[PDB]
Homo-oligomer: A and B are copies of this chain.
Amino acid sequence: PVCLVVAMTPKRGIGINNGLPWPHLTTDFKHFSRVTKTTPASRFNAVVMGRKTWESMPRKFRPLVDRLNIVVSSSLKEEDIAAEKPQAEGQQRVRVCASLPAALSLLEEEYKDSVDQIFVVGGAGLYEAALSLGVASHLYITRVAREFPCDVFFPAFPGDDILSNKATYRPIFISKTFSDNGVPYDFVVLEKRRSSAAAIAPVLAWMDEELIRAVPHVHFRGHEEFQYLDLIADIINNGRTMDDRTGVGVISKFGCTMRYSLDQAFPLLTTKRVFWKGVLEELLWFIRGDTNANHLSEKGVKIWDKNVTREFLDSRNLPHREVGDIGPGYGFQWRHFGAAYKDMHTDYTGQGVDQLKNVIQMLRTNPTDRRMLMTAWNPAALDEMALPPCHLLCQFYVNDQKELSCIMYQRSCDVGLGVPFNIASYSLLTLMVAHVCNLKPKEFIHFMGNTHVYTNHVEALKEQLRREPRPFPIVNILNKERIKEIDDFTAEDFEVVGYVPHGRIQMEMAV
């Protein structure tokens, strides 16, 4: 009964030139350190490594303190290690054996009472050995989300779908995404599968009085994507079947909340590929105050097309609107609130209230002010819009450490399709503002009104809730020096890093 501890790229790479492939992952080191050391008294833990693995270690850290170090080697002897450095008091002497099966017997022989848990700690030779012999009950894996040049690899195994797209190992633990030196990563654990309260109790018994789950086997649910997945399950389990403007049926709930950290990684949902080109192109479009949808479509982003066709414009009772014109919609209200709309071709510069600019000026000069809001809802103009805004309001907030948070309120949420797009969209806006105001991005908070999954998406979502999420990627702003105002960002000023989502899922847009 042994455990495998590893840090590992999506392609199972683990080393290069007898060393680590990535810059230092401090939190990984701390995690590895804690896992291999902590115990429920008299007992300590055993770390088993290979020669190359022992040798790669900086001399400062070998031998691994408070732990019975063991090396598997044919060519090195117990004296080489005893003479490599002078030993310190309070530790066991490193022991060397022919193979892993041999190295295990040594633990059964001499250390039958001293040690608690055993850990195979590297490298490819030993990990492979343990997998063959099937004594490994658990895998403590650090998924490095970025790809790195490698010559040494972790052997393939049943259930390596947790790494990338293609007696088993199923995930039982998935942590939130951490990042160090511009490298996003997280921790999984895969398991080998193949009367002070008595008085209250019966009162609870009569009170309770009356199905679908996301990745049910995953018990510790650190990953923040669980919010979205538990939110899906919830609506399907406890929603209410409604009719619709569209004619397509709906299961809905009212009043919902997720929030996402922006300091370590970016919440680009990993359980299905998010059309990021679309969120970027559209957010840029918003910020310009552009209301011509053809500018999006010509760039290969057809998200608004169905909602600006000749047919739809007339159902919405706007025969005079050119094909493409979303009326005075989201962008317009951000940049020219309450201005008199004409068409998508008109220049509205200096007109209306520039909510966006005001929000930034306030952020830069008086960040304690509680009137840092931007609204898209304009009662007077709703009829002129092709579609009333879903995400209609956002508030910004700064704390002590110059960390920026953003709340967005959405009236009507398409959970299968719209939500992950809207999460990534406003999380990006936060990064943009944070940079321009000289603030650290902290948190994005999602406030939802009518929250619904369409009945024709239900089949497809059940498939999605079997998928265990991958580590969130990092979004970087490039050209950090060139960009000084919110209007200075372009499509080329960003780079998604480490995005390894699951394959695409087709969902029809309710027209």
Contact = CB atoms under 8 A, between A and B. Distances in A.
A57 interface: no
A380 B407 contact: no
Interface string A350-372: 00110100100000000011110
Contacts of A368: 242-245
A254 interface: yes
Nearest to A398: B242
A199 B187 contact: no
Q: How many copies of this chain does one complex carry?
A: 2
Interface in A344-398: 352-353, 355, 358, 368-371, 373, 375, 377-380, 382, 388, 392-393, 395, 397
A58 interface: no
Nearest to A178: B207
Given A31-B206, A371-B388, 20 more contacts: A1-B195, A34-B206, A38-B205, A137-B199, A138-B195, A172-B196, A173-B199, A173-B203, A189-B199, A240-B400, A245-B369, A254-B397, A255-B447, A338-B378, A353-B379, A370-B450, A373-B392, A375-B377, A397-B449, A409-B409
Given A31-B206, A370-B245, A375-B377, A395 B219 contact: no
Nearest to A245: B369
Interface string A1-45: 101000000000000000000000000001101110010100000
Given A400-B241, A449-B407, A31 B412 contact: no
B242 A400 contact: yes
A191 interface: yes
A45 to B, nearest CB: 10
A197 interface: yes
A203 B242 contact: no
A373 B378 CA distance: 11
A175 B203 contact: yes
Interface of A: 1, 3, 30-31, 33-35, 38, 40, 117, 137-138, 140, 172-173, 175, 187, 189, 191, 195-200, 202-207, 219-220, 222, 240-245, 252, 254-255, 257, 259, 337-338, 352-353, 355, 358, 368-371, 373, 375, 377-380, 382, 388, 392-393, 395, 397, 399-400, 405, 407, 409, 411-412, 443, 445, 447, 449-450
Contact of A254 (B220, B407, B450): B407
A200 B219 contact: yes
A379 to B, nearest CB: 4
Nearest to A338: B380
Contacts of A412: 370-371
Contact of A200 (B220, B245, B373, B449): B220
A481 to B, nearest CB: 30
Contacts of A205: 34, 38
B371 A445 contact: no
A199 B380 CA distance: 59
A275 to B, nearest CB: 23
Contacts of A449: 370, 373, 395, 397, 407
A393 B337 CA distance: 17
B204 A220 contact: yes
Contacts of A254: 397, 399, 405, 407, 443, 445
A195 B392 CA distance: 49
A189 B203 contact: yes
A191 B199 contact: yes
Nearest to A354: B379
23 contacts: A3-B199, A34-B206, A137-B199, A138-B195, A140-B203, A175-B207, A191-B196, A200-B219, A241-B400, A242-B368, A242-B400, A243-B368, A245-B370, A254-B399, A255-B407, A255-B443, A337-B379, A338-B379, A353-B380, A370-B412, A395-B411, A395-B449, A447-B447
Nearest to A395: B449
A157 B510 CA distance: 64
